[PDB]
Design a protein around this nucleic acid. Structure first.
Ligand SMILES: Nc1nc2c(ncn2[C@@H]2O[C@H](COP(=O)(O)OP(=O)(O)NP(=O)(O)O)[C@@H](O)[C@H]2O)c(=O)[nH]1
Ligand code: MET
Ligand SMILES: [Mg+2]
Length: 409
RNA sequence: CGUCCCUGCUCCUUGCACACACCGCCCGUCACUCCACCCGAGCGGAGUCCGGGUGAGGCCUGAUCUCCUUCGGGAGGUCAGGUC
């Protein structure tokens, strides 16, 4: 399995996906046909091996396969770890899925375009979302250096070295790439091998995991007799799951009784485990996993339990409707082309509460200095007291990050 | 032939929220104004209740130093314990 989850953030079309192509060799598909004409839309996914050419010279020593005869000589590169990416989209309004994604990440790579005016609306928006959430392991990258002057990718490296200054990003190193022709990527591999280090996760902890996809393996027309189970798609964060463990999802499906609303936990067994294209018997944090189940795929078709969280069956997790956020605000709206000042929060207003991987909306009942209580629509399964959350508003038709904080229970 | 349909008109009735007499009256939406008004994210100030803390003076218990005293007592310093 992959050891660690790395984001690829940045502005729209700056080539976040193309840089996941040049490292993994895997494309996100670019799909929905509408993504095949737009660009990446659902969260991409791709894995690879990072060895190291011990018997040669760095950074070109940093391989992708067990093959060192590429650089210096043969001595089959000692394998260091296997990894996995999560490619967020770059378009301004697909803010609500990149946040969602960011509940799973152990580190990131900021893909700035060398041929556009540096602080681009989303490049920043993402960055401060990073600084907010706690993803303190960043590596900036200057992407399209194959279509610019040799003066131009330096003068921008000024602009990056000056923005990256008053912000927390000390020596966050800026490795210029060319995701297109896969030149100077092995030096990006040396960055990610040094700076984005493999954290320790205590396995004895309560099994908890997030979900960001889930799919009907059933092709148009698999017969009933070999109807494989439904498939939940997401990343473990704390613990390790095993093949043939009893499980529950939360908040889980809601019933209908004449206009009423009522969510409830669903139970099932782990039918199968798989990482990449290879099936496993256990699963551990870092990486996005997938869990074959025995529940009706109608329940997990398009991506129905998106935002849900998986835990042990017979575990202790509150399914809140109403919640106490301790919070703070950005002084600006780093997101809009325009930097208009974030107003102070008004009661009886609509806001988009990102908690974990779930992207709920909710209404504000109380407003203190830094303690607000939010009634919701679709519940939230609050697995701990250390639930980072992110707070957006509708400024002008398109949803915008404005404050953050922690969930209190 | 006659009067059905066009049209005008007389007579009788029927209903009207119409009388500038149906080219009448008038209702809601949304658009935007007029006059007075209610809540309210919040800030400043007060009142009260509860639990405790302090608490000056007076009274009682005890003293030391007195001063005075007609030896019955008064005043008083100061200090320990209890009370209003
Ligand atoms: N010349 C040049 N072109 C590039 C480079 N990287 C990507 N491209 C091109 O730019 C286009 C957009 O790439 P893409 O990876 O979708 O950008 P993105 O930011 O990941 N899109 P999304 O917002 O969906 O994640 C592609 O058609 C690709 O061919 C580069 O380094 N040099
Ligand atoms: C994008 S789903 C996450 C990894 C999964 N086991 C496969 O792929
Ligand atoms: Mg992309």
């Amino acid at each position: 399995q992959p050891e660690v989850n790395i984001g690829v953030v940045g502005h729209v079309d700056h080539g976040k996906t193309t840089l996941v192509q040049a490292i993994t060799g895997i494309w996100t598909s670019k799909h929905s046909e509408e993504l095949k004409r737009g660009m990446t839309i659902k969260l991409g996914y791709a894995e690879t091996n990072i060895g190291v050419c011990e018997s040669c010279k760095k950074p070109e020593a940093y391989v992708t396969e067990p093959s060192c005869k590429s650089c210096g000589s043969d001595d089959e590169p000692k394998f260091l770890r296997r990894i996995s990416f999560i490619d967020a989209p770059g378009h301004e309004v697909l803010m609500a899925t990149m946040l969602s994604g960011a509940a799973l990440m152990d580190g990131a790579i900021l893909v700035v375009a060398a041929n556009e005016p540096f602080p681009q609306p989303q490049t920043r928006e993402h960055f401060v979302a990073l600084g907010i959430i706690g993803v303190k392991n960043l590596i900036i990258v200057q992407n399209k250096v194959d279509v610019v002057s040799k003066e131009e990718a330096l003068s921008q490296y000024r602009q990056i070295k000056q923005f990256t200054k008053g912000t927390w990003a000390e020596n966050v190193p800026i490795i210029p790439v060319s995701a297109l022709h896969k030149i100077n990527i092995d030096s990006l591999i040396e960055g990610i091998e040094e700076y984005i280090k493999t954290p320790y996760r205590d396995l004895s902890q309560k099994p908890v995991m997030l979900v960001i996809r889930s799919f009907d393996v059933n092709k148009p027309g698999t017969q009933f007799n070999e109807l494989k189970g439904g498939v939940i798609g997401g990343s473990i964060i704390q613990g390790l799951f095993k093949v043939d463990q009893e499980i529950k999802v939360l908040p889980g499906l809601r019933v209908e009784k004449q206009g009423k609303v009522s969510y409830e936990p669903i139970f099932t067994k782990i039918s199968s485990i798989r990482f990449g294209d290879e099936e496993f018997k256990e699963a551990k944090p870092g990486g996005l996993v997938a869990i074959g189940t025995y529940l009706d795929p109608s329940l997990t078709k398009a991506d129905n339990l998106l935002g849900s969280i998986i835990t042990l069956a017979d575990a202790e997790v509150p399914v809140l409707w109403n919640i106490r956020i301790k919070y703070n605000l950005l002084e600006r709206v780093v997101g809009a082309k325009e930097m208009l000042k974030v107003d102070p929060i008004r009661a009886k207003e609509t806001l988009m509460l990102s908690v974990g991987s779930s992207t709920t909306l909710g209404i504000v009942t109380s407003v203190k200095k830094d303690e607000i209580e939010v009634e919701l629509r679709r519940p939230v399964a609050v697995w701990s007291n250390n639930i980072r959350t992110v707070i957006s508003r509708q400024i002008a038709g398109r949803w915008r990050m404005i404050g953050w904080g922690l969930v209190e229970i």
